[PDB]
């Protein structure tokens, strides 16, 4: 199907307690493949997926060099943004960046992106045409103007249409065993009794990949969206994910309710009943 490669950069300022904490992680789809930690020992870009470990010292050296330049760019941004916002030098502040690329089933470019935040809210963003910018406020118009004169869209568009999708593709084949797999949800239902006239009914989806999934409860074909408890999809820790949904049934109406699972790994939407 469609695929994506994304890099997340996080830069936190700990004033008078060292240099800014820099963290980078890389993902193909829902699979993390690399990491940098400004605190970690190695001081190299390191592997976090088995299918990326033997890519050569030239891949590992080039990657270490670049993320060390990202480090030093984000250190400078933290100070510049304190300025833009008249903030004290003692304050801890956050900068986040996200960029990457998608492809379709043709493995050809689908879309590219490069968003940016500060203190948890949108700062500036590369527009979907990958040629213009979208500042969230006043202080971000300056930075917008800066990148327009430096021609930073041209440089991003360059990496997003080429090196990005191009390597997304190399990886998809390198770890084609992990990256082109599909684990369909392993489902079941549980029944616990809150009290005497009430019973918790819970539908489970375990060990699925990718994370994208839908779990819906129903009563007589009626969606209980507003009466259901859904939980956020969560890492099991082994490249797969989990998720459940629960409703409360008046002890006896169990047969009225049914759970519906939707996943790209299921040929047909599973329907669970308690019977």
């Amino acid at each position: 199907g469609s695929h994506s490669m994304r890099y997340f950069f996080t830069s936190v300022s700990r004033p008078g307690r060292g240099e800014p904490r820099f963290i980078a992680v890389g993902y193909v789809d829902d699979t993390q493949f690399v990491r940098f930690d400004s605190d970690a020992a190695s001081q190299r870009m390191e592997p976090r997926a088995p299918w990326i470990e033997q890519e050569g010292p030239e891949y590992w050296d080039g990657e270490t060099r670049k993320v060390k330049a990202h480090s030093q760019t984000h250190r400078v941004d933290l100070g510049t943004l304190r300025g833009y916002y008249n903030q004290s030098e003692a304050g801890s502040h956050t900068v986040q960046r996200m960029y990457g690329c998608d492809v379709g089933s043709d493995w050809r470019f689908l879309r590219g992106y490069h968003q940016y935040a500060y203190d948890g809210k949108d700062y500036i963003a590369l527009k979907e045409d990958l040629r213009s910018w979208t500042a969230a406020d006043m202080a971000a118009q300056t930075t917008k103007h800066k990148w327009e004169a430096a021609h930073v869209a041209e440089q991003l568009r360059a990496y997003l249409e080429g090196t990005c999708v191009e390597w997304l593709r190399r990886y998809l084949e390198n770890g084609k065993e992990t990256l082109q797999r599909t684990d369909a949800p392993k489902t079941h239902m549980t029944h616990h009794a809150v009290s005497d006239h009430e019973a918790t009914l819970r539908c489970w989806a375990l060990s699925f990949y990718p994370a994208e999934i839908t779990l819906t409860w129903q009563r007589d074909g009626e969606d209980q969206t507003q009466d259901t408890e859904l939980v956020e999809t969560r890492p099991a820790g082994d490249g797969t994910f989990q998720k459940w949904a629960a409703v409360v049934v008046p002890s006896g109406q169990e047969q009225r309710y049914t759970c519906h699972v939707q996943h790209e790994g299921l040929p047909k939407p599973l329907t669970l009943r308690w019977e």
Binding site: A24, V67, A150, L156, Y159, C164
Partner: peptide, 9 residues
């Protein structure tokens, strides 16, 4: 593979 190539906000 990540970005080159420089930057600077």
């Amino acid at each position: 593979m990540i970005l080159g190539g420089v930057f600077x906000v």
